[PDB]
Amino acid sequence: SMHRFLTISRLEELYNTRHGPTLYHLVRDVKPPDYRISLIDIGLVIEYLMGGAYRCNYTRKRFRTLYHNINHFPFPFHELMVWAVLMKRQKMALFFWQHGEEAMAKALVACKLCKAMAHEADISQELNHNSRDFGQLAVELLDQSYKQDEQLAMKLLTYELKNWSNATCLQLAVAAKHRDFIAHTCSQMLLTDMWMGRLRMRKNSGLKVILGILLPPSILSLEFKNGRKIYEFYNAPIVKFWFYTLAYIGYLMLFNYIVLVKMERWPSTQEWIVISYIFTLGIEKMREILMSEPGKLLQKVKVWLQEYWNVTDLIAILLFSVGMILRLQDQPFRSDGRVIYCVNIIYWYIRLLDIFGVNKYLGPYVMMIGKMMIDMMYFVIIMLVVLMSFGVARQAILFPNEEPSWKLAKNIFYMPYWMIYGEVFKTGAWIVPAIMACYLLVANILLVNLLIAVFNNTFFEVKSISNQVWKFQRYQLIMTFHERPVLPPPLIIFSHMTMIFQHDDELKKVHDFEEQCIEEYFREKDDRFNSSNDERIRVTSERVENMSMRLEEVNEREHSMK
Amino acid sequence: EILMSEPGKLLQKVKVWLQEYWNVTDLIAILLFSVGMILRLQDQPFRSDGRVIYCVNIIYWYIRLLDIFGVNKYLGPYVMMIGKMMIDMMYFVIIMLVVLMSFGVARQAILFPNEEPSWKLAKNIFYMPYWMIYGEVFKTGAWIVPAIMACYLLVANILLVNLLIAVFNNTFFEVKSISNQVWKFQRYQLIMTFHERPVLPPPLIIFSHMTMIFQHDDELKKVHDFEEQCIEEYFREKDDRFNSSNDERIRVTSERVENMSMRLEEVNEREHSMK
Ligand SMILES: CC(=O)[C@H]1CC[C@H]2[C@@H]3CC=C4C[C@@H](OS(=O)(=O)O)CC[C@]4(C)[C@H]3CC[C@]12C
Ligand SMILES: CC(=O)[C@H]1CC[C@H]2[C@@H]3CC=C4C[C@@H](OS(=O)(=O)O)CC[C@]4(C)[C@H]3CC[C@]12C
Numbered sequence A: 001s002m003h004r005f006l007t008i009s010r011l012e013e014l015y016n017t018r019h020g021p022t023l024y025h026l027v028r029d030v031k032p033p034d035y036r037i038s039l040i041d042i043g044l045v046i047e048y049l050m051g052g053a054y055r056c057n058y059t060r061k062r063f064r065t066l067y068h069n070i071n072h073f074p075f076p077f078h079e080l081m082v083w084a085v086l087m088k089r090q091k092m093a094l095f096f097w098q099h100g101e102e103a104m105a106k107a108l109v110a111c112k113l114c115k116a117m118a119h120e121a122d123i124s125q126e127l128n129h130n131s132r133d134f135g136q137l138a139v140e141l142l143d144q145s146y147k148q149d150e151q152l153a154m155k156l157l158t159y160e161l162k163n164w165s166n167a168t169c170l171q172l173a174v175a176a177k178h179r180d181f182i183a184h185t186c187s188q189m190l191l192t193d194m195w196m197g198r199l200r201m202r203k204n205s206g207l208k209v210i211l212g213i214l215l216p217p218s219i220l221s222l223e224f225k226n227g228r229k230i231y232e233f234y235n236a237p238i239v240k241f242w243f244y245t246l247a248y249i250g251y252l253m254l255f256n257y258i259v260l261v262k263m264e265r266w267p268s269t270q271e272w273i274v275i276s277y278i279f280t281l282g283i284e285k286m287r288e289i290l291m292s293e294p295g296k297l298l299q300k301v302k303v304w305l306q307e308y309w310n311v312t313d314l315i316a317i318l319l320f321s322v323g324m325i326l327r328l329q330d331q332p333f334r335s336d337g338r339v340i341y342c343v344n345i346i347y348w349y350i351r352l353l354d355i356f357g358v359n360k361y362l363g364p365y366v367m368m369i370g371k372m373m374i375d376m377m378y379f380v381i382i383m384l385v386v387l388m389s390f391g392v393a394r395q396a397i398l399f400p401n402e403e404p405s406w407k408l409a410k411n412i413f414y415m416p417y418w419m420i421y422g423e424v425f426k427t428g429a430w431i432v433p434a435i436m437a438c439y440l441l442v443a444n445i446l447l448v449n450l451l452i453a454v455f456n457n458t459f460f461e462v463k464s465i466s467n468q469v470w471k472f473q474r475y476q477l478i479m480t481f482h483e484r485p486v487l488p489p490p491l492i493i494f495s496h497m498t499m500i501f502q503h504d505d506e507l508k509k510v511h512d513f514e515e516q517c518i519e520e521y522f523r524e525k526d527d528r529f530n531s532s533n534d535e536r537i538r539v540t541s542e543r544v545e546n547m548s549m550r551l552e553e554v555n556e557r558e559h560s561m562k
Numbered sequence B: 001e002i003l004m005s006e007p008g009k010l011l012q013k014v015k016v017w018l019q020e021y022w023n024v025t026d027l028i029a030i031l032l033f034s035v036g037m038i039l040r041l042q043d044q045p046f047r048s049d050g051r052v053i054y055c056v057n058i059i060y061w062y063i064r065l066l067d068i069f070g071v072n073k074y075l076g077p078y079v080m081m082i083g084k085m086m087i088d089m090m091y092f093v094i095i096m097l098v099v100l101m102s103f104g105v106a107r108q109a110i111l112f113p114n115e116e117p118s119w120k121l122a123k124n125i126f127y128m129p130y131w132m133i134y135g136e137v138f139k140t141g142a143w144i145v146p147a148i149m150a151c152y153l154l155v156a157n158i159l160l161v162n163l164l165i166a167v168f169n170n171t172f173f174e175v176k177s178i179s180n181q182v183w184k185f186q187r188y189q190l191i192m193t194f195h196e197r198p199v200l201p202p203p204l205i206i207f208s209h210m211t212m213i214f215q216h217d218d219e220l221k222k223v224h225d226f227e228e229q230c231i232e233e234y235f236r237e238k239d240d241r242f243n244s245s246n247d248e249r250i251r252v253t254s255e256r257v258e259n260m261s262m263r264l265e266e267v268n269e270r271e272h273s274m275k
């Protein structure tokens, strides 16, 4: 009995043993040669590898305190599989996964662990195979469960796991970035149901949401079927998304009207509205960070800072506040400070790109731009190397008598078309500049055509995958907007006030269903493999050889009998 | 044509007849042309205002030839590609605006520090001139910042142009991969459309309507037998082809070998006992 066999001392000895086929180095980095490894350190390194905002049942201070002070793991298979994947023992991990509770959750964790170990660190080989194999197994298990029962598969996809720090399968898949799992039909159906919220409407959803936002009192009553109806309509994430979009458009229009016209000693009403917008957004950001409690206050910001867009937003807010402060510093400083928050507008116009990835037909363009930014960066070096040489040569040939005056960069970088063409059309002094002009003119068009071809190839390569990639971001967007309150950014100031004012048989059935699903998967795999033509041909050949040999031997007996 | 579209009675005949978009557009164009003609004969003040309407109306008639240019083998792919790329251009417009308008507004705000709205800023922001911006490219910071803005705008313009080129190339390739197959379908519609129509041209069918008003089982059994024979032959051929498949034959041979080997092994014991 593994349950009876399992014990703290035995597991510690197993972990600390070196009699077998990167655990030591990784533990040392996370944490002393031949140091006695305990469950606490193993859990700590596990949490390190999983990522931020994660937890492990064994990897906790209370568990460490208990260990320091039955002693049987209720689910030994989980720890055994975690160890097996930790020490890079694949067949044993497969066997353990063959018999275990909540196999899908463990499989996704293994895929996450394999990828994380590969990135931290044969390393390439295991990354390509081990992590991919675990992900494929999870996908196959999901597919079988959906075939057996759609409702039960949907229920299994989302439910709190006490063992794994209460993280659903979807969250683990997203953390592992396994696009295949999310792309499955059941996952997309669940995401669409979540996005539509309580309302079941599925035809002309955008127009219906726009009408509901425009005409609450009349639209909401009818839209509820497709009081409490208005409240549940508001709480849906889609209407929140449209509300935020409209508020952002209004903010953009006010910002355009403010900076573009005039300035006075005291700001106008529109500038006050914009300042209120930014103040409320800052309050919302601070609240969101505050609710990001896991890891305590000190270790909450570190995880929250992973996203780049959030950091850019903070930087933009700081620059806007600095510009506003400088504005109210008399005319000499007002004129100097206006430009800063005039330039600040650029960030807000570009922030819509991160929101333009939601649409099916719009995200490919953003992905292509992101891909081609680096290509343009590299192309710039070649462009400079080619053009600057000829420009410098042409400039040197002309203006034989000259003084630096820090004014040659403009002359070399001018690169005019009409002027060069005219310059194209004693004798040698005229011939050489013509040759230089012709070479520059040819090089310009050569580079232009090269850039065109580069962009075409990059766009084709991006488009070959953008459709598959698009589906992943939907879960992030939906889980992001769903958590956010219902009021727009300028009106959530009251929302915070309301927030402050406010302050087992099914499990057994699911376990049985999972066991049945895995048994059926193994049976189907074995039957399909045994029914393969290649295997059957081999079996027939071996049987024929033995049958022929027996017949030949029997022939001698028949002759002797006669 | 609507009158002869009798099925569904008078009330339910228009509903079906209205499915085609081109017919509705034709009706709209006819109504606008008639309105413009009526306005034309309303003295000079209304004649000058009504002429423009039926001047603009010409655009529809020039574009109606596209629905007739799909017949040709080599001409329909272009129309299909245009129809496909219309939506792509619609989506591209949003990105173009989002990118360009920000820089344009920033540049406009940096310049003209003292200004009044006068409902005349859209032209300034949307001007987007090439030569003027290039000249503007080439105390110190006030000169540096506009140069940076101009350079960014100049780079963005060509980036967007190349992006549009790539998008159009990809869309054209995808359309051309299927246009040849698609073209054949429209021929039946065109043929059954023109066949029903009378012989005179549109301006002369006025007499055609006058002429119209003036005017006002063994084979079945053989066909049934042929169909029955065809379906029987199809089933027979399907069964024969499936049974002749290598995969099926290998399985059959393997099963027979196993049974034959088992019988031989059992017979061996009988032979030994007999001896
Ligand atoms: C590729 C080029 O052609 C560039 C690259 C480096 C540039 C140089 C940088 C340093 C200075 C010092 C300055 O003296 S000063 O009194 O005006 O400050 C005069 C201008 C001068 C000589 C630049 C001339 C142009 C460059 C050679
Ligand atoms: C992105 C932009 O820059 C555009 C978008 C919305 C436009 C504004 C719409 C409303 C009006 C009212 C008008 O007052 S009036 O007496 O002339 O009628 C002056 C012009 C003004 C301020 C426009 C300025 C330009 C915009 C800010």
Ligand SMILES: Cc1cc(NC(=O)[C@H](c2ccccc2)N2CCCc3ccccc32)no1
Binding pocket: A241, A244, A245, A248, A251, A277, A281, A284, A285, A288, A352, A355, A484, A489
């Ligand atoms: C389109 C579109 C824009 C957008 N902008 C926001 O939603 C919101 C915001 C509000 C006012 C000004 C600037 C941005 N902002 C950015 C992204 C999501 C988010 C999350 C928490 C707190 C703020 C915030 N949403 O759709």
